[PDB]
């Protein structure tokens, strides 16, 4: 009973674009708390939406396991931005600056990973509209 309704296909694709917008808003806009928390909630919902889609393609395509090992570059994007921010703050508060560095890099991978999925979304949208 796969709820693969076109209304879902539309959302999954539309989530890939919004997920990138999240990172841009986080980088550009100097959000503080209340408005910053709302941003991360939106991102969390988006990552879950994309969380499902990925697990789905995983199960079918030659069954789970095998698939994931080929699409690891897609994992970093599936990490909620608010989760990394939360972690970085906790790490800095403990003076674990060496780790803050690595967490920094993980954030870079998250951005690249979402950018990758961003391009796929656009390319796919172009196909549904003007097939080729």
């Amino acid at each position, epitope marked *: 009973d796969v709820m693969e309704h076109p209304l879902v296909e539309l959302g999954v694709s539309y989530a890939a674009l919004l997920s990138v917008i999240v990172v841009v808003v986080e980088y550009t806009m100097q959000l503080s708390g209340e408005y910053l928390v709302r941003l991360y909630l939106v991102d969390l919902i988006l990552v879950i939406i994309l969380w499902a889609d990925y697990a789905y393609r995983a199960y079918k395509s030659g069954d789970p396991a095998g698939y994931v090992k080929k699409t690891l570059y897609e994992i970093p994007a599936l990490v909620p931005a608010g989760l990394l921010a939360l972690i*970085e*703050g906790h790490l*800095a*508060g403990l*003076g*674990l*600056f*060496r780790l*803050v*560095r690595l967490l920094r890099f993980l954030r870079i991978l998250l951005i690249i990973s979402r950018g990758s999925k961003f391009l796929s979304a656009i390319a796919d949208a172009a196909d549904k509209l003007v097939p080729r």
Partner: antibody, heavy 118, light 108 residues
Framework: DVQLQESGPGLVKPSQSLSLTCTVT?????????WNWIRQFPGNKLEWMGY???????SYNPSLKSRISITRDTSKNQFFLQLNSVTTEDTATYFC???????????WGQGTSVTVSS | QIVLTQSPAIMSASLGDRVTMTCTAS???????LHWYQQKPGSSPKLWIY???NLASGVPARFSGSGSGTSYSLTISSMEAEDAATYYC????????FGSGTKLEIKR
């Protein structure tokens, strides 16, 4: 070669505000770590006052919370200390210091003497 | 927020003597956050030993740090004239606090 240098008036009147500047060279205060203000009293007791880290968040000594403020100017790679309503007991040598991993203070400024007197 | 009591407050040792000083905490301190500093009159303190037992770059092998929980120590296998100074321990738990210091003098 990381280097910190403190600057500002060495004399302040009671009730007024004490302001010091730390200019850092050889490393960017926005890159990583904590940037502290630590003072040492005439009897040589050391006391951590607070810091502002690479991301701009501040942390203060609870006994100074209501009187202090640490800010920064990233374009000049400097951070500042402001201690309000100072009294005779705030007379001490003030150090700007870098807080490395686990808050080990690896680089200290040479320190500046501040006297609070009328 | 813990209090670090250093002992002895003041001590003197003959050049060549083994030297041991202690840092006692009011509550348990994580070994990764216990650091020692050496300071001589007229200059700023220098990181000497970090995370309980790691000697700072320029620090001679005669020095060593040990301990855990609420009890740490700094030892000098053999006292040299340049070791005369005041040593401070430091810790972080909820806040940053410094020990009362141990002033090491030369015995003659």
């Amino acid at each position: 070669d990381v280097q910190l240098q403190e600057s500002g008036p060495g004399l302040v009147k009671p009730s007024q505000s004490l302001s010091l500047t730390c200019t850092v060279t050889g490393y960017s205060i926005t890159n990583n770590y904590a940037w502290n203000w630590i003072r040492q009293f005439p009897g040589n007791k050391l006391e951590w006052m607070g810091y502002i880290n690479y991301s701009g968040t501040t942390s203060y000594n609870p006994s100074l919370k209501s009187r202090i403020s640490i800010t920064r100017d990233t374009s000049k790679n400097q951070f500042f200390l402001q201690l309000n309503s100072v009294t005779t007991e705030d007379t001490a040598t003030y150090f700007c210091v870098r807080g490395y991993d686990y808050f080990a203070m690896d680089y200290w400024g040479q320190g500046t003497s501040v006297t609070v007197s009328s | 927020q813990i209090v670090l009591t250093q002992s002895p407050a003041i001590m003197s040792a003959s050049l060549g003597d083994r030297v041991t000083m202690t840092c006692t905490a009011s509550s348990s301190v994580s070994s990764s956050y216990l650091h020692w500093y050496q300071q001589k009159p007229g200059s700023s303190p220098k990181l000497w030993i970090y995370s309980t037992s790691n000697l700072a770059s320029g620090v001679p092998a005669r020095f060593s740090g040990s301990g855990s929980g609420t009890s740490y120590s700094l030892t000098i296998s053999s006292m040299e004239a340049e070791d005369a100074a005041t040593y401070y321990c430091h810790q972080f738990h909820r806040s940053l606090t410094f020990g009362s210091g141990t002033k090491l003098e030369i015995k003659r």
